[PDB]
Amino acid sequence: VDFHGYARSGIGWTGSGGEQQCFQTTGAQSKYRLGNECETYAELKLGQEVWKEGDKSFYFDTNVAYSVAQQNDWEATDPAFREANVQGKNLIEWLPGSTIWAGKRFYQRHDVHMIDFYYWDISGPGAGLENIDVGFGKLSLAATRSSEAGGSSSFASNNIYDYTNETANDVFDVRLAQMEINPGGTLELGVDYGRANLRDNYRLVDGASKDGWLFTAEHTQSVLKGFNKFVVQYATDSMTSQGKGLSQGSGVAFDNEKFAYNINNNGHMLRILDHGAISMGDNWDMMYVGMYQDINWDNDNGTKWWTVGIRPMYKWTPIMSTVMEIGYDNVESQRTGDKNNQYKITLAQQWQAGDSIWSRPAIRVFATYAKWDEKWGYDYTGNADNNANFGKAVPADFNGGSFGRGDSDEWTFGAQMEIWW
Amino acid sequence: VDFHGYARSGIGWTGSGGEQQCFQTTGAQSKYRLGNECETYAELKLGQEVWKEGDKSFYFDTNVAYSVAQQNDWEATDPAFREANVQGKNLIEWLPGSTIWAGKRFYQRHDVHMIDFYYWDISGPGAGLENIDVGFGKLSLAATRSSEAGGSSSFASNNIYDYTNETANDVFDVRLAQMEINPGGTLELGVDYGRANLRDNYRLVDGASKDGWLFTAEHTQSVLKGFNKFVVQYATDSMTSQGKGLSQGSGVAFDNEKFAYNINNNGHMLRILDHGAISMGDNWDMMYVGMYQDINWDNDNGTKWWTVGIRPMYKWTPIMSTVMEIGYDNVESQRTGDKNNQYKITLAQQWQAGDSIWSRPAIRVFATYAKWDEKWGYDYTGNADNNANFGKAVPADFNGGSFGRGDSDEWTFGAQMEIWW
Amino acid sequence: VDFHGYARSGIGWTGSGGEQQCFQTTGAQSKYRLGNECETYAELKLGQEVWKEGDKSFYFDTNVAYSVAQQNDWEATDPAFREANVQGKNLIEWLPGSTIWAGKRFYQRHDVHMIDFYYWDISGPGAGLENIDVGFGKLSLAATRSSEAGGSSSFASNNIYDYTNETANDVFDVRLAQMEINPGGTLELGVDYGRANLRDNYRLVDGASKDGWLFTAEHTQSVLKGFNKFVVQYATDSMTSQGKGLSQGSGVAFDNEKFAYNINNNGHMLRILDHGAISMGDNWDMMYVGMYQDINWDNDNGTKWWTVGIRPMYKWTPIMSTVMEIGYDNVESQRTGDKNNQYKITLAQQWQAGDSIWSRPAIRVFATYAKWDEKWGYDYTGNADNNANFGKAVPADFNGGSFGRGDSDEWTFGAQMEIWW
């Protein structure tokens, strides 16, 4: 039995009092994670190669995930059963090296570690034919499923409160990877087509996006004992709200009282991203990100987000290091033109298993400082039935209220482990 | 650590739109499973032989089961903790080869794979003394527990709404197996006695079945590189509603609003079943079932169910096959005499680990067609307080309503893995 | 992968009817467990040494716990994710042999097996530096976290119903162990300081304990092939309600309707405990406890509890034994001066893996008799809003009601396994 997974767990304090607090910019889809993670999260994977004859094999893999508040010993939770799939490798003679698979799977996910941000993730229930050797690269085909909680009506209606039936969304994914385009440099291209897939006689609200595309281009360059990844993605309509390869064609969301409201996602997203991790000598490693993400919707409630950060690591010893993370977010509301910004600074002393910035496990002792200035926020007051602005970006002081996190400061400290195995 | 279990997971589409739909006859207790399974289901077993001295050993076994809708990646659920037991083998010198056990256990279950139907299952919390060598066969004794959600009142009452206290049911099970009765043929006999087991001063509703028996006879014949099982079972009163060896003596059920209603199970069940799996040459395997099950209740709301189906497999290659499944159900309401029927046809291309129809894992690509014609259904409209017919079989058009699945067609397709290890 | 854990599971009957019932004295914090455990409880631990170079290593450990009613096969539950931590051993050159750790962990827990009673348990999310070699002993430092469900208000208020915000409690723990003080005798000393840790501008109710101390002294003596532990603990204010090393500074509790009520824990607790397990020849083992615990609160609602019990084991054979357990509880309400008492007698035939009273797994067949006489109980009628006495000790016949378990008898029997591996 193969035992693999991911986990993080710790204990933290907020400088002004109480348990650790974590700092994310209103409107940003990520935060700089170092010394800024407020939950115990674990994935326990049990897998096995259950049959092997020569070059041919079947591999079975599972994944059970737990997320708890880490404020107590006994923390009862609903585990998420995320993966259960079988991979059949080298079973098709005319397509040597290629894998056939079906089941729930984390399918070739692309992320930026330091902000824990997945930018290409179509994971879910699915099936496909992977790694077809096409001479100048590897071709992979897959179909995966996601579902919105409501969005569909069984009868013709102009009332959005009738659109409460779950709507399956399908994604069809084609990727062509490992194209050697320059010395030490590979290129990967992907296309995703996603669409709401309605039951017979069901309908989406008038104007629903329904379907959409996501186009990806990723260049990977071997540099300074590490790598650089330069990414450009462009998404359309139904693919803009999740933004990582899953479709949300219904354009319907629900408040806490189960009232439906319209979040039409017609429009486009442009994401330009560069990240990597490099070594400078034998004492220094560094991770870095810079990203510009523009989500432009027809309803005007999109966002324009810039991020940049660095995470240098100084190795005193093969297992002991000093790690620092500096991260900056700036988010502009499309609706109001206001801007939200934050800069976060973390200092950590770390013991890790190996001398790389990728080495895990790691035990950290840290101190974090964040300073933010938010001039807008989302209006989630009342409910969607009472409030016509429910879910719209709004200036910080709209109607005498307070929206967004204001203009303030805070520091946290504590200890944490992180591991993948 | 031994890692074992069962899992199935896939992605599917309904021809008229939306996610895969699965087809079961109203009134039947099973469906033809090939290309007709609409959830991700997994049992993860971790066990260990924790002590061994010579012939003597203790084995520890567990089982955590997950069932999710396979419509999304993150699917939070309540896992069922189904097994946790210790088996002590060869500990009693005067009963060589026998096992003593206690804990929650899947105890000698008998099922028909292709319709995923358990016909002899008393699994639950329990204890027993298994495999006593009695010369001409093996004798096993066990006691297991189940519990109805309500059914018991703490005081004398004529109001069925007072019978809301959980009622434990005990089953006492004696089996005599492995009797060689003919060349290549074994016989197994079993008796189950089950009864509601009331707390001091609690009561069942007047007329409650209370207790009941289940008698089983199974003949196993080695034929054509596989087997044939011919089964006859007869159950009485409290053993008829579950019908696999667990008792439900209280005869009380609850609607969604927690209103109690009477489902007295006085009466009998006769089940005549034949199933097996045979090989025809080196290229053909086949599974087959035929069953007749008559549940005759004093209240007239029983059923009379006929099933038959076959699942031939053509082996093109040692790992690649074409599998087809054809299944037919016919259910007659005891109450009205109407009939519900369905025929399902599935075609699949499959890659599996081995050249048997029992070989797992298996990756399937399938297409399923079902056609049904239902003239009756159960009335679950209103609640048990408003509706005197709550839970009764009822003609399809009763009182201008629509009951059962009507007279229609549908086709589905998709991909799926199944594995036991 | 290392597979470790704890589990118990069985089936039982109550002499007067229905499923097994378990017997605990009102006011006691424990019960004599043999033949007196009414649930299936399991901890499944998966761990791994993920990196090792010479003397240095990192160990990763997890723990998922399940507790179900063992009344049915399919028992869906919320597993508790109790442990997820990394232990870095021998990483600090100037502190040889010491371990640095962070994550959720069962930290050096001290319990009395036979009454399943933890007397020193600060487990939870935490971090620390363990086993510092200090010449004449081992020094350990740790900080762990716990949280009360409510207790904090965001604004100044005299209304206890406003104090509904969770309040983090921190515990700082220092232990000095393994001091050889006499031949075959070790001494361990510990100090815990715990305090409610309020968010900025939040408050506790007027008079809240807020913080407190727990002082522990444990002497361990090697005797008669086993051991004797003699324990003295003294706790103050916020450390008295949980009583094992976790703080509950807020002094606020909630009824079932979410009404807050005051359980101020100002006062002190004195615990004097002696327990051990000894061998008498080759045929006899015995576990025993004696404890006096006095919880003296300023509000008068504390308790004074005496327990004593013994568990002799007669070994007929290396794997087969006859086990008996006799246990007595006596609890006096501080408020009324009434006394609750119970004596429990259990007889079991057992098969176990090894010839010790500590050997597991064990398969038991038992009969239990309990006789109790309770002259007081806690008033949990109405809710905290209607009832001024909510939660107070009260004479058995207070206001014509019935409080406590009365004056009665009962016997149970069944089978059970228990294992740790």
Ligand SMILES: OC[C@H]1O[C@@](CO)(O[C@H]2O[C@H](CO)[C@@H](O)[C@H](O)[C@H]2O)[C@@H](O)[C@@H]1O
């Ligand atoms: O698939 C990535 C996706 O998973 C989520 C949970 O829905 O994040 C969790 O899982 C990740 C590993 O699979 C971790 O990186 C992350 O810390 C954890 O919360 C989404 O947030 C993420 O986009």
Ligand SMILES: OC[C@H]1O[C@@](CO)(O[C@H]2O[C@H](CO)[C@@H](O)[C@H](O)[C@H]2O)[C@@H](O)[C@@H]1O
């Ligand atoms: O004990 C069989 C019994 O389990 C149920 C769930 O209550 O079926 C689940 O478990 C079986 C394996 O233990 C699978 O065959 C089945 O697919 C799964 O749903 C009952 O349906 C069944 O009678």
Ligand SMILES: OC[C@H]1O[C@@](CO)(O[C@H]2O[C@H](CO)[C@@H](O)[C@H](O)[C@H]2O)[C@@H](O)[C@@H]1O
């Ligand atoms: O840490 C001990 C603490 O855990 C509890 C559950 O909250 O007990 C459970 O876990 C123990 C093992 O970790 C078992 O000994 C016990 O039987 C089980 O209920 C608390 O009751 C106990 O104080």
Ligand SMILES: [Mg+2]
């Ligand atoms: Mg402005």
Ligand SMILES: [Mg+2]
């Ligand atoms: Mg008719």
Ligand SMILES: [Mg+2]
């Ligand atoms: Mg739940």
Ligand SMILES: [Mg+2]
């Ligand atoms: Mg009195």
